[PDB]
Each structure stands twice: as C-alpha cells, then as structure tokens.
Design a protein around this ligand. Structure first.
Ligand SMILES: [Zn+2]
Length: 290
C-alpha cells in the first residue's frame, strides 16, 4: 500500500503514474497575500482540478507531487484537488534547495526524525502521510546536503518509502545500507550524458530527467541499452518544473500521454515497454520495500 493524500492505496490502483510533478509551489501562497491579482483559493483549485481532469481523461491515474514544507506544499489543497479530479496524489516529505535556519542546524538523526514524522505520523495536523522523500540539491556538494541525503536514506531504510533527488550520491545511499532500487536520481541537461545514465542504471538506480523530443530520445537510448526497468516518467521532460514553476504547454499535465507516448510509438518503442515505464516501474518504486 502507498500513502496518498486521500489515504492508502494498493499497488494495482496506482496505474499510469507521473513521479515528479508540481501542483504546489512557491507562488500559490501569494493568493493569500494578493488575491485581487492572483485570484481566490477557489479559482486556483478550479484551475488545478480542470487540468488534472484533463490529465485523467488522457489516462493519468496517479501523480507524485514533490513539493516539501519549505517549498510551498499544501496537502489540504492536494487532497481537495485529488478528490475533485479523481486522480491519486502522493505527497512528499523532504527539503528543498535553501531550507530555513532552523533546519540547517539539525543533525542527521534529527532530520531523519522529521522525515519519519511526516511519513509515519502525518503532515502538520492533517493526518495525511507522505509517500516519497524529495531531496533537492543545488550544485556543489556540501556537508549539509550530504547530511540531508543521509537522513533521507535512513528514513527510507526505516519505512521503505522511496527517495527522489537530483545530481557521488550513490555512495552515500549505499553507505547507509539502502538499495539503489529505492532511489531515483534525476538528471538535468548539464548532466544528461547517456554514459552517466547507464552507469547509475546498471547499479540499480531509477533514472529521471528534470527540447522534449531530445529528452524522449535519451529515454529511448536508455531503453535500447536494456535499462527500461530503471526509467520513471514525468511532465518535467517538457520543461524544468519545480516549486518555483509549477505544472499549472498547450497539453498541460496531459503532455506525457498526448505527446510523448505517441512520439515514442512513432520511434518504435513497443507497447509493453511503454506500459513498463508508466505503470510497472513507478508502482515498484512507490511500493514501500524494505
Ligand atoms: Zn519535477
């Protein structure tokens, strides 16, 4: 069973899953400070529900929202849009690029307990539990970033909930006893080299990407190398979405099933492989595994 914002779900209920999406983010809060310009909360919820119902109509069944407490996560909003659009949503714990003072001073043991609190107890006073750990990294490795990755690895070891991060790191995860099949390492264009992707893929890590046709061909290259079981999919292939710039692109959150899947079909990626990367791989990733 996977923790969603409306409660636990079985593996088989997850279906077609996007694994690194952005409903919540930095900018939604300013609707509280300035609704005259940005619109009401109800209008934001309405825009989000409409976009998710279109993604649902195109075939998306589950999305993983990777916003964290320090990057604008709003799990009560996620639960409302999940119910209205009939799309499962997995919430994340973790930390973003530049966390507050009060978090930058914590030990690995303390940060582990923070992540575990949001996985085992709930987020804030909502009772909604996170189903993934997101660790956003800036650039140059720093001791605090290594500390956060270690805390995430330990929370994953305790609960079996997967970790998703950005580009070394693999030695830290293995340092802590965590199987690579619990970790998705996301790569940007500056780290897109197919050689690096296959290297991490051969060691058991899941691979994410954060033009879109050239990203899709990188995916095909990875498949052609035999690594289809290590691939996760996300609307991030179109554009580097984040808490800075959320998913709410004339295809909206339906971009993957309406544009990328037909294109991969045109390039000859077979049906069983496409079902593997959109259904089997994310279900195996999200399913808590010790
Ligand atoms: Zn993303």
């Amino acid at each position: 069973r996977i923790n969603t914002v409306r409660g636990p779900i079985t593996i088989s209920e997850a279906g077609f899953t996007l694994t690194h999406e952005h409903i919540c983010g930095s900018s939604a809060g300013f609707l509280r400070a300035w609704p005259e310009f940005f619109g009401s909360r109800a209008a934001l919820v309405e825009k989000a529900v409409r976009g998710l119902r279109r993604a649902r109509a195109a075939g998306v069944r589950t999305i993983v929202d990777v916003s964290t407490f320090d990057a604008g996560r709003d799990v009560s909003l996620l639960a409302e849009v999940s119910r209205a659009a009939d799309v499962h949503i997995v919430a994340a714990t973790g930390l973003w690029e530049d966390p507050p003072l009060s978090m930058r001073l914590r030990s690995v043991e303390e940060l582990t307990q923070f992540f575990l609190r949001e996985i085992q107890y709930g987020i804030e006073d909502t009772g909604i539990r996170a189903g993934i750990i997101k660790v956003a990294t800036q650039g140059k490795a720093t001791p605090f970033q290594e500390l956060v990755l270690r805390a995430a690895a330990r929370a994953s070891l305790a609960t079996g909930v997967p970790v998703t991060t950005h580009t070394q790191q693999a030695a830290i995860f293995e340092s802590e006893g965590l199987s690579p099949s619990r970790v998705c390492i996301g790569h940007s264009d500056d780290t897109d080299d197919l050689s690096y992707l296959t290297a991490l893929a051969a060691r058991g890590y899941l691979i994410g990407l954060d033009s879109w046709q050239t990203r899709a061909l990188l995916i095909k290259a990875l498949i052609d190398q035999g690594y289809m079981k290590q691939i996760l999919v996300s609307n991030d292939w179109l554009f580097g979405f984040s808490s800075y710039v959320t998913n709410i692109n004339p295809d909206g959150m339906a971009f993957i099933p309406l544009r990328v899947i037909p294109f991969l079909r045109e390039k000859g990626v077979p049906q069983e492989t496409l079902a593997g990367i959109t259904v089997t791989n994310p279900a195996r990733f999200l399913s808590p595994t010790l």
